[PDB]
Coordinates of C-alpha atoms in Angstrom, one line a residue:
Chain A
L1 CA 92.7 109.8 89.1
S2 CA 96.1 111.3 90.0
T3 CA 97.0 113.1 93.3
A4 CA 93.4 112.8 94.6
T5 CA 92.4 114.7 97.7
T6 CA 89.6 113.6 100.1
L7 CA 87.2 116.4 101.0
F8 CA 84.5 114.5 102.8
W9 CA 84.2 110.9 104.2
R10 CA 81.3 110.4 106.5
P11 CA 78.0 108.4 107.0
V12 CA 74.9 110.3 106.0
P13 CA 71.2 109.3 106.6
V14 CA 69.6 108.7 103.2
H15 CA 66.1 107.6 102.2
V16 CA 66.8 104.9 99.6
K17 CA 64.1 103.9 97.1
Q18 CA 64.3 101.0 94.7
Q19 CA 62.4 101.1 91.5
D20 CA 59.4 99.1 92.8
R21 CA 60.6 97.9 96.2
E22 CA 60.7 99.4 99.7
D23 CA 61.6 103.0 100.7
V24 CA 64.1 102.6 103.5
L25 CA 66.1 105.0 105.6
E26 CA 69.7 103.9 105.6
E27 CA 73.2 105.2 106.6
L28 CA 75.2 105.6 103.5
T29 CA 78.9 106.5 103.3
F30 CA 79.7 109.5 101.1
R31 CA 83.2 110.0 99.9
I32 CA 84.0 113.2 97.9
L33 CA 87.3 113.5 96.1
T34 CA 89.0 116.0 93.9
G35 CA 92.0 115.5 91.6
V36 CA 93.2 115.8 88.0
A37 CA 92.8 113.6 85.0
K38 CA 95.6 111.1 84.5
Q39 CA 95.8 112.2 80.8
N40 CA 95.6 116.0 81.6
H41 CA 97.1 117.6 84.7
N42 CA 95.3 120.8 83.8
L43 CA 91.9 119.1 83.9
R44 CA 90.3 119.0 87.4
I45 CA 87.8 116.3 88.3
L46 CA 85.3 115.8 91.0
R47 CA 84.2 112.4 92.2
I48 CA 81.5 111.4 94.6
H49 CA 81.1 107.8 95.9
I50 CA 78.0 106.5 97.7
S51 CA 78.5 103.2 99.5
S52 CA 77.4 101.2 102.5
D53 CA 79.3 99.6 105.4
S54 CA 76.6 96.9 105.7
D55 CA 76.3 96.1 102.0
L56 CA 79.6 95.8 100.2
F57 CA 77.9 95.4 96.8
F58 CA 76.2 98.9 97.2
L59 CA 78.1 101.5 95.2
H60 CA 77.0 104.6 93.2
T61 CA 79.3 107.1 91.6
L62 CA 79.2 110.6 90.1
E63 CA 82.1 112.1 88.2
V64 CA 82.3 115.5 86.6
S65 CA 85.2 117.3 85.0
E66 CA 85.6 121.1 85.1
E67 CA 85.2 121.3 81.3
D68 CA 81.9 119.5 81.6
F69 CA 80.6 121.4 84.6
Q70 CA 78.6 124.0 82.6
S71 CA 76.2 121.2 81.6
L72 CA 75.5 120.6 85.3
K73 CA 75.3 124.4 85.9
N74 CA 72.6 124.7 83.2
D75 CA 70.7 121.7 84.4
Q76 CA 70.7 122.7 88.1
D77 CA 70.9 126.5 87.8
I78 CA 74.2 126.6 89.7
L79 CA 75.8 130.0 90.0
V80 CA 79.2 129.2 91.4
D81 CA 82.4 127.9 89.8
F82 CA 83.7 124.3 89.8
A83 CA 86.1 125.0 92.7
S84 CA 83.2 126.2 94.9
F85 CA 80.8 123.4 94.1
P86 CA 82.0 120.6 96.4
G87 CA 81.8 122.9 99.5
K88 CA 78.1 123.5 98.7
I89 CA 77.3 119.8 98.5
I90 CA 79.3 119.2 101.7
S91 CA 77.3 122.0 103.4
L92 CA 74.0 120.3 102.4
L93 CA 75.3 116.9 103.5
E94 CA 76.2 118.2 107.0
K95 CA 72.7 119.6 107.3
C96 CA 71.2 116.2 106.5
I97 CA 73.4 114.6 109.2
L98 CA 72.1 117.1 111.8
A99 CA 68.4 116.7 110.8
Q100 CA 65.9 115.5 113.5
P101 CA 62.4 114.2 112.8
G102 CA 60.6 117.2 114.3
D103 CA 62.8 119.9 112.7
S104 CA 61.8 122.9 110.6
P105 CA 63.8 123.6 108.5
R106 CA 64.9 120.1 107.9
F107 CA 67.3 118.8 105.2
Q108 CA 66.7 115.3 103.8
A109 CA 68.7 113.1 101.4
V110 CA 67.0 110.8 98.9
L111 CA 68.4 108.2 96.5
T112 CA 66.1 106.7 93.9
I113 CA 67.4 103.7 91.9
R114 CA 65.5 102.7 88.7
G115 CA 68.1 100.5 87.0
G116 CA 71.2 101.7 85.2
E117 CA 70.6 105.1 86.8
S118 CA 70.1 106.5 90.3
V119 CA 68.9 110.0 91.1
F120 CA 70.3 111.6 94.3
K121 CA 68.5 114.7 95.7
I122 CA 68.7 116.8 98.8
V123 CA 65.5 118.6 99.9
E124 CA 64.7 121.2 102.5
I125 CA 61.5 121.0 104.5
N126 CA 60.6 124.6 105.4
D127 CA 57.4 126.0 107.0
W128 CA 55.1 125.0 104.1
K129 CA 56.9 122.7 101.6
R130 CA 59.7 120.5 100.4
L131 CA 62.3 122.6 98.5
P132 CA 64.8 120.9 96.2
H133 CA 68.3 122.2 96.7
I134 CA 70.2 119.8 94.3
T135 CA 69.4 116.9 92.0
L136 CA 72.3 114.8 90.7
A137 CA 72.5 111.8 88.5
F138 CA 74.7 108.9 89.7
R139 CA 75.7 105.7 87.9
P140 CA 75.8 102.1 89.2
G141 CA 79.2 100.8 90.3
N142 CA 82.5 102.6 90.1
Chain B
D1 CA 32.0 133.2 89.0
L2 CA 32.7 132.6 92.7
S3 CA 30.0 133.3 95.3
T4 CA 30.9 135.3 98.4
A5 CA 34.5 135.8 97.0
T6 CA 37.1 137.6 99.1
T7 CA 40.1 139.3 97.5
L8 CA 43.3 138.6 99.5
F9 CA 45.8 140.2 97.3
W10 CA 45.8 142.6 94.3
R11 CA 49.1 144.1 93.4
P12 CA 51.5 144.6 90.5
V13 CA 54.6 142.3 90.5
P14 CA 57.8 142.4 88.5
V15 CA 57.8 139.3 86.3
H16 CA 60.2 138.0 83.7
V17 CA 57.9 137.1 80.9
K18 CA 58.8 134.7 78.1
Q19 CA 56.5 134.4 75.1
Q20 CA 56.4 131.3 72.8
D21 CA 59.9 131.3 71.3
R22 CA 59.8 135.1 71.5
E23 CA 61.5 137.7 73.7
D24 CA 62.2 137.4 77.4
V25 CA 61.1 140.7 78.8
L26 CA 60.7 142.1 82.4
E27 CA 57.2 143.5 82.8
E28 CA 54.9 144.6 85.6
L29 CA 52.0 142.2 85.9
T30 CA 49.1 142.5 88.3
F31 CA 48.3 139.5 90.5
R32 CA 44.9 139.0 92.1
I33 CA 44.3 136.2 94.6
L34 CA 40.8 135.5 95.7
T35 CA 39.0 132.8 97.7
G36 CA 35.3 131.9 97.6
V37 CA 32.8 129.0 97.3
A38 CA 31.3 127.2 94.3
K39 CA 28.1 128.7 93.0
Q40 CA 26.7 125.2 92.9
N41 CA 28.0 124.2 96.4
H42 CA 28.5 126.6 99.3
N43 CA 30.6 123.9 101.1
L44 CA 33.2 123.7 98.3
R45 CA 35.9 126.3 98.7
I46 CA 37.7 127.5 95.6
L47 CA 41.0 129.4 95.1
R48 CA 41.6 131.7 92.1
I49 CA 44.6 133.5 90.9
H50 CA 44.4 136.1 88.0
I51 CA 47.4 137.5 86.2
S52 CA 46.6 140.7 84.4
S53 CA 48.3 143.9 83.2
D54 CA 47.3 147.6 83.9
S55 CA 48.9 148.6 80.5
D56 CA 47.4 145.7 78.5
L57 CA 43.7 145.1 79.3
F58 CA 43.6 142.2 76.9
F59 CA 46.0 140.2 79.1
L60 CA 44.5 137.6 81.4
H61 CA 45.9 134.3 82.8
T62 CA 44.0 132.3 85.3
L63 CA 44.5 129.5 87.8
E64 CA 41.7 127.8 89.7
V65 CA 41.9 125.1 92.3
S66 CA 39.1 123.7 94.5
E67 CA 39.8 122.4 98.0
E68 CA 38.8 118.9 96.9
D69 CA 41.4 119.0 94.1
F70 CA 44.1 120.6 96.2
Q71 CA 45.7 117.2 97.0
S72 CA 46.8 116.9 93.4
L73 CA 48.7 120.2 93.7
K74 CA 50.1 119.2 97.1
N75 CA 51.5 116.0 95.6
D76 CA 52.9 117.8 92.5
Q77 CA 54.6 120.7 94.4
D78 CA 55.3 118.9 97.6
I79 CA 53.1 121.3 99.6
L80 CA 52.8 120.5 103.4
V81 CA 50.1 122.9 104.5
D82 CA 46.3 122.8 104.0
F83 CA 44.1 124.7 101.5
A84 CA 43.4 127.6 103.9
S85 CA 47.1 128.3 104.6
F86 CA 48.2 128.1 100.9
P87 CA 47.3 131.6 99.6
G88 CA 49.2 133.3 102.4
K89 CA 52.4 131.5 101.4
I90 CA 52.0 132.6 97.7
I91 CA 51.3 136.1 98.9
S92 CA 54.5 136.2 101.0
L93 CA 56.5 135.0 98.0
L94 CA 55.0 137.6 95.7
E95 CA 55.7 140.4 98.2
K96 CA 59.4 139.2 98.3
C97 CA 59.4 139.4 94.5
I98 CA 58.1 143.0 94.7
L99 CA 60.7 144.0 97.2
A100 CA 63.8 142.4 95.5
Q101 CA 66.5 144.9 94.8
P102 CA 69.7 144.7 92.7
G103 CA 72.5 143.5 95.1
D104 CA 70.1 141.8 97.4
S105 CA 71.1 138.3 98.6
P106 CA 68.9 136.3 98.7
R107 CA 66.8 137.7 95.9
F108 CA 63.4 136.5 94.8
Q109 CA 62.3 136.5 91.2
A110 CA 59.1 135.8 89.4
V111 CA 59.0 134.1 86.0
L112 CA 56.2 133.4 83.5
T113 CA 56.6 131.2 80.5
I114 CA 53.8 131.4 78.0
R115 CA 53.0 128.7 75.5
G116 CA 50.0 128.3 73.1
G117 CA 47.4 127.1 75.5
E118 CA 49.1 127.1 78.8
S119 CA 51.5 129.3 80.8
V120 CA 53.9 128.2 83.6
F121 CA 54.5 130.5 86.5
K122 CA 57.4 130.1 88.9
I123 CA 59.0 132.0 91.8
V124 CA 62.7 131.4 92.4
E125 CA 65.1 132.3 95.1
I126 CA 68.6 133.4 94.0
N127 CA 71.0 132.7 96.8
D128 CA 74.8 132.6 96.9
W129 CA 75.2 129.6 94.7
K130 CA 72.0 128.7 92.8
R131 CA 68.4 129.5 91.7
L132 CA 66.0 127.7 94.1
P133 CA 62.4 127.1 92.7
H134 CA 59.9 127.8 95.5
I135 CA 56.7 127.2 93.6
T136 CA 55.6 126.2 90.0
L137 CA 52.0 126.8 88.9
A138 CA 50.1 126.2 85.7
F139 CA 47.8 129.0 84.3
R140 CA 45.1 128.8 81.6
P141 CA 43.5 131.4 79.3
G142 CA 40.8 133.4 81.2

Protein backbone atom coordinates (compact mmCIF):
# COMPACT_ATOMS: atom_id res chain seq x y z
CA LEU A 1 0.00 0.00 0.00
CA SER A 2 1.37 3.41 -1.02
CA THR A 3 1.14 6.65 1.04
CA ALA A 4 -0.98 4.96 3.72
CA THR A 5 -2.72 7.01 6.42
CA THR A 6 -3.53 5.75 9.93
CA LEU A 7 -7.08 6.60 11.00
CA PHE A 8 -7.27 4.57 14.20
CA TRP A 9 -4.81 2.71 16.43
CA ARG A 10 -6.15 1.74 19.86
CA PRO A 11 -6.87 -1.27 22.08
CA VAL A 12 -10.52 -2.39 22.08
CA PRO A 13 -12.28 -4.90 24.36
CA VAL A 14 -13.32 -7.89 22.24
CA HIS A 15 -15.11 -11.14 23.08
CA VAL A 16 -13.01 -13.70 21.22
CA LYS A 17 -14.46 -17.12 20.40
CA GLN A 18 -12.48 -20.01 18.92
CA GLN A 19 -14.26 -22.69 16.88
CA ASP A 20 -14.75 -25.10 19.80
CA ARG A 21 -12.65 -23.52 22.54
CA GLU A 22 -13.23 -20.89 25.21
CA ASP A 23 -15.07 -17.60 24.81
CA VAL A 24 -12.71 -15.01 26.29
CA LEU A 25 -12.80 -11.24 26.70
CA GLU A 26 -9.51 -9.81 25.48
CA GLU A 27 -7.99 -6.43 24.60
CA LEU A 28 -7.22 -6.46 20.89
CA THR A 29 -5.39 -3.71 19.02
CA PHE A 30 -7.23 -2.29 16.01
CA ARG A 31 -5.29 -0.50 13.30
CA ILE A 32 -7.29 1.11 10.51
CA LEU A 33 -5.47 2.41 7.45
CA THR A 34 -6.38 4.06 4.17
CA GLY A 35 -4.23 4.46 1.07
CA VAL A 36 -4.10 3.70 -2.63
CA ALA A 37 -3.15 0.59 -4.59
CA LYS A 38 0.52 0.42 -5.58
CA GLN A 39 -0.62 -0.50 -9.10
CA ASN A 40 -3.29 2.21 -9.32
CA HIS A 41 -3.10 5.59 -7.57
CA ASN A 42 -6.76 6.16 -8.46
CA LEU A 43 -7.84 3.06 -6.53
CA ARG A 44 -8.43 3.75 -2.83
CA ILE A 45 -8.07 0.92 -0.31
CA LEU A 46 -9.19 0.36 3.29
CA ARG A 47 -7.28 -1.99 5.59
CA ILE A 48 -8.12 -3.09 9.13
CA HIS A 49 -5.71 -5.10 11.26
CA ILE A 50 -6.69 -6.92 14.44
CA SER A 51 -3.73 -7.88 16.61
CA SER A 52 -2.74 -8.47 20.24
CA ASP A 53 0.07 -7.03 22.37
CA SER A 54 0.16 -10.24 24.42
CA ASP A 55 0.10 -12.70 21.51
CA LEU A 56 2.44 -11.74 18.68
CA PHE A 57 1.07 -14.58 16.54
CA PHE A 58 -2.46 -13.15 16.67
CA LEU A 59 -3.35 -11.28 13.48
CA HIS A 60 -6.54 -10.88 11.44
CA THR A 61 -6.96 -8.59 8.42
CA LEU A 62 -9.71 -7.06 6.31
CA GLU A 63 -8.99 -5.29 3.03
CA VAL A 64 -11.55 -3.67 0.76
CA SER A 65 -11.00 -1.52 -2.32
CA GLU A 66 -13.41 1.23 -3.38
CA GLU A 67 -14.31 -0.66 -6.56
CA ASP A 68 -15.26 -3.71 -4.48
CA PHE A 69 -17.16 -1.76 -1.82
CA GLN A 70 -20.60 -2.28 -3.39
CA SER A 71 -20.40 -5.99 -2.54
CA LEU A 72 -20.04 -5.03 1.12
CA LYS A 73 -22.78 -2.41 0.76
CA ASN A 74 -25.18 -5.05 -0.57
CA ASP A 75 -24.20 -7.60 2.07
CA GLN A 76 -24.46 -5.24 5.06
CA ASP A 77 -27.09 -2.78 3.79
CA ILE A 78 -24.66 0.15 4.02
CA LEU A 79 -26.01 3.47 2.76
CA VAL A 80 -22.89 5.67 2.78
CA ASP A 81 -19.95 5.90 0.39
CA PHE A 82 -16.48 4.36 0.69
CA ALA A 83 -14.98 7.56 2.11
CA SER A 84 -17.52 7.75 4.95
CA PHE A 85 -17.34 4.06 5.89
CA PRO A 86 -14.20 4.08 8.12
CA GLY A 87 -15.58 6.87 10.31
CA LYS A 88 -18.66 4.77 11.05
CA ILE A 89 -16.60 1.74 12.07
CA ILE A 90 -14.45 4.01 14.23
CA SER A 91 -17.56 5.44 15.92
CA LEU A 92 -18.71 1.91 16.77
CA LEU A 93 -15.27 0.96 18.10
CA GLU A 94 -15.15 4.02 20.37
CA LYS A 95 -18.51 2.99 21.83
CA CYS A 96 -17.18 -0.51 22.53
CA ILE A 97 -14.26 1.02 24.42
CA LEU A 98 -16.61 3.14 26.56
CA ALA A 99 -18.95 0.22 27.38
CA GLN A 100 -19.53 -0.82 31.01
CA PRO A 101 -21.07 -4.13 32.28
CA GLY A 102 -24.28 -2.46 33.52
CA ASP A 103 -24.84 -0.19 30.52
CA SER A 104 -27.94 0.18 28.35
CA PRO A 105 -27.42 0.86 25.57
CA ARG A 106 -24.16 -1.09 25.46
CA PHE A 107 -21.94 -1.76 22.46
CA GLN A 108 -20.03 -5.02 22.25
CA ALA A 109 -17.33 -6.39 19.95
CA VAL A 110 -17.19 -10.08 19.05
CA LEU A 111 -14.68 -12.07 17.01
CA THR A 112 -15.46 -15.65 16.00
CA ILE A 113 -12.70 -17.79 14.48
CA ARG A 114 -13.67 -21.05 12.71
CA GLY A 115 -10.47 -21.69 10.76
CA GLY A 116 -9.46 -19.96 7.53
CA GLU A 117 -12.10 -17.36 8.36
CA SER A 118 -13.00 -15.12 11.28
CA VAL A 119 -16.21 -13.13 11.64
CA PHE A 120 -16.08 -9.77 13.40
CA LYS A 121 -19.29 -8.13 14.60
CA ILE A 122 -20.33 -5.18 16.74
CA VAL A 123 -23.67 -5.42 18.52
CA GLU A 124 -25.75 -2.97 20.53
CA ILE A 125 -27.60 -4.12 23.63
CA ASN A 126 -30.65 -1.89 23.96
CA ASP A 127 -33.68 -2.13 26.25
CA TRP A 128 -34.83 -5.51 24.96
CA LYS A 129 -32.32 -7.16 22.59
CA ARG A 130 -28.93 -7.41 20.88
CA LEU A 131 -28.86 -5.35 17.68
CA PRO A 132 -26.23 -6.17 15.03
CA HIS A 133 -24.68 -2.96 13.68
CA ILE A 134 -22.02 -4.48 11.46
CA THR A 135 -20.69 -7.90 10.49
CA LEU A 136 -17.36 -8.16 8.68
CA ALA A 137 -15.34 -11.06 7.33
CA PHE A 138 -11.66 -11.08 8.28
CA ARG A 139 -8.91 -13.40 7.10
CA PRO A 140 -6.08 -15.08 9.06
CA GLY A 141 -2.67 -13.39 8.98
CA ASN A 142 -1.69 -10.34 6.94
CA ASP B 1 -58.40 -21.04 19.27
CA LEU B 2 -57.11 -19.32 22.41
CA SER B 3 -59.09 -19.23 25.65
CA THR B 4 -59.57 -15.86 27.44
CA ALA B 5 -57.63 -14.12 24.66
CA THR B 6 -56.93 -10.39 24.87
CA THR B 7 -56.21 -8.23 21.81
CA LEU B 8 -53.28 -5.90 22.48
CA PHE B 9 -52.97 -4.35 19.03
CA TRP B 10 -55.11 -4.19 15.87
CA ARG B 11 -53.96 -1.65 13.29
CA PRO B 12 -53.07 -1.27 9.59
CA VAL B 13 -49.31 -0.94 8.94
CA PRO B 14 -47.37 0.07 5.82
CA VAL B 15 -45.44 -3.00 4.67
CA HIS B 16 -43.13 -3.58 1.72
CA VAL B 17 -44.45 -6.90 0.47
CA LYS B 18 -42.46 -9.22 -1.78
CA GLN B 19 -44.19 -12.22 -3.33
CA GLN B 20 -42.30 -15.29 -4.56
CA ASP B 21 -40.05 -13.95 -7.35
CA ARG B 22 -42.85 -11.47 -8.07
CA GLU B 23 -43.25 -7.73 -7.48
CA ASP B 24 -42.11 -5.76 -4.43
CA VAL B 25 -45.08 -3.56 -3.56
CA LEU B 26 -45.92 -1.23 -0.67
CA GLU B 27 -49.27 -2.27 0.81
CA GLU B 28 -51.32 -1.58 3.93
CA LEU B 29 -51.53 -4.74 6.04
CA THR B 30 -53.47 -5.13 9.29
CA PHE B 31 -51.59 -6.50 12.28
CA ARG B 32 -53.38 -8.17 15.18
CA ILE B 33 -51.47 -9.08 18.32
CA LEU B 34 -53.22 -11.17 20.97
CA THR B 35 -52.29 -13.08 24.12
CA GLY B 36 -54.22 -15.87 25.81
CA VAL B 37 -53.90 -19.37 27.21
CA ALA B 38 -53.97 -22.84 25.70
CA LYS B 39 -57.41 -24.42 25.51
CA GLN B 40 -55.88 -27.59 26.95
CA ASN B 41 -53.85 -25.84 29.67
CA HIS B 42 -54.85 -22.62 31.45
CA ASN B 43 -51.29 -22.30 32.79
CA LEU B 44 -49.71 -22.17 29.33
CA ARG B 45 -49.65 -18.66 27.88
CA ILE B 46 -49.65 -18.22 24.11
CA LEU B 47 -48.85 -15.28 21.83
CA ARG B 48 -50.41 -14.91 18.39
CA ILE B 49 -49.78 -12.42 15.60
CA HIS B 50 -52.11 -12.25 12.61
CA ILE B 51 -51.29 -10.44 9.38
CA SER B 52 -54.37 -9.62 7.31
CA SER B 53 -55.69 -7.06 4.83
CA ASP B 54 -58.85 -4.95 4.87
CA SER B 55 -58.92 -4.96 1.06
CA ASP B 56 -58.10 -8.65 0.59
CA LEU B 57 -60.11 -10.85 2.95
CA PHE B 58 -58.39 -14.00 1.65
CA PHE B 59 -55.05 -12.79 3.02
CA LEU B 60 -53.91 -14.26 6.35
CA HIS B 61 -50.46 -14.98 7.81
CA THR B 62 -50.03 -16.23 11.37
CA LEU B 63 -47.32 -16.54 14.02
CA GLU B 64 -47.85 -18.48 17.23
CA VAL B 65 -45.42 -18.89 20.11
CA SER B 66 -46.09 -20.39 23.54
CA GLU B 67 -44.29 -19.21 26.67
CA GLU B 68 -42.53 -22.57 26.98
CA ASP B 69 -41.25 -22.30 23.40
CA PHE B 70 -40.25 -18.65 23.77
CA GLN B 71 -36.65 -19.55 24.61
CA SER B 72 -36.08 -20.76 21.04
CA LEU B 73 -37.11 -17.34 19.73
CA LYS B 74 -35.00 -15.57 22.38
CA ASN B 75 -31.93 -17.47 21.21
CA ASP B 76 -32.67 -16.95 17.52
CA GLN B 77 -33.35 -13.21 17.75
CA ASP B 78 -31.11 -12.36 20.74
CA ILE B 79 -34.09 -11.19 22.81
CA LEU B 80 -33.30 -10.15 26.39
CA VAL B 81 -36.78 -9.66 27.89
CA ASP B 82 -39.37 -12.18 29.08
CA PHE B 83 -42.49 -13.51 27.34
CA ALA B 84 -44.77 -10.93 28.98
CA SER B 85 -42.71 -7.91 27.86
CA PHE B 86 -42.19 -9.11 24.28
CA PRO B 87 -45.49 -8.00 22.65
CA GLY B 88 -45.06 -4.42 23.87
CA LYS B 89 -41.71 -4.21 22.08
CA ILE B 90 -43.19 -5.41 18.78
CA ILE B 91 -46.10 -2.98 19.16
CA SER B 92 -43.73 -0.05 19.66
CA LEU B 93 -41.84 -0.99 16.49
CA LEU B 94 -45.05 -1.31 14.47
CA GLU B 95 -46.20 2.12 15.64
CA LYS B 96 -42.85 3.57 14.53
CA CYS B 97 -43.44 1.95 11.13
CA ILE B 98 -46.88 3.57 10.99
CA LEU B 99 -45.47 7.00 11.85
CA ALA B 100 -42.47 6.99 9.50
CA GLN B 101 -42.44 9.92 7.08
CA PRO B 102 -40.35 10.73 4.00
CA GLY B 103 -37.28 12.65 5.18
CA ASP B 104 -37.42 11.23 8.69
CA SER B 105 -34.12 10.09 10.16
CA PRO B 106 -34.15 7.56 11.68
CA ARG B 107 -36.96 5.91 9.74
CA PHE B 108 -38.52 2.53 10.53
CA GLN B 109 -39.69 0.20 7.79
CA ALA B 110 -41.70 -3.04 7.72
CA VAL B 111 -40.93 -5.81 5.23
CA LEU B 112 -42.68 -9.08 4.39
CA THR B 113 -41.12 -11.71 2.12
CA ILE B 114 -43.58 -14.40 1.06
CA ARG B 115 -42.46 -17.83 -0.11
CA GLY B 116 -44.46 -20.98 -0.89
CA GLY B 117 -45.13 -22.24 2.63
CA GLU B 118 -43.56 -19.56 4.81
CA SER B 119 -43.22 -15.78 5.02
CA VAL B 120 -40.47 -13.78 6.72
CA PHE B 121 -41.40 -10.54 8.47
CA LYS B 122 -38.80 -7.93 9.39
CA ILE B 123 -38.72 -4.45 10.87
CA VAL B 124 -35.67 -2.37 9.97
CA GLU B 125 -34.32 0.97 11.09
CA ILE B 126 -32.86 3.21 8.40
CA ASN B 127 -30.39 5.54 10.09
CA ASP B 128 -27.73 7.81 8.59
CA TRP B 129 -25.53 5.02 7.22
CA LYS B 130 -27.37 1.66 7.11
CA ARG B 131 -30.49 -0.47 7.49
CA LEU B 132 -30.60 -1.98 10.97
CA PRO B 133 -32.76 -5.10 11.46
CA HIS B 134 -34.61 -4.89 14.79
CA ILE B 135 -36.63 -8.09 14.52
CA THR B 136 -37.14 -11.02 12.16
CA LEU B 137 -40.18 -13.29 12.51
CA ALA B 138 -41.41 -16.34 10.59
CA PHE B 139 -45.10 -16.56 9.68
CA ARG B 140 -47.22 -19.53 8.52
CA PRO B 141 -50.45 -19.93 6.55
CA GLY B 142 -53.49 -19.31 8.76
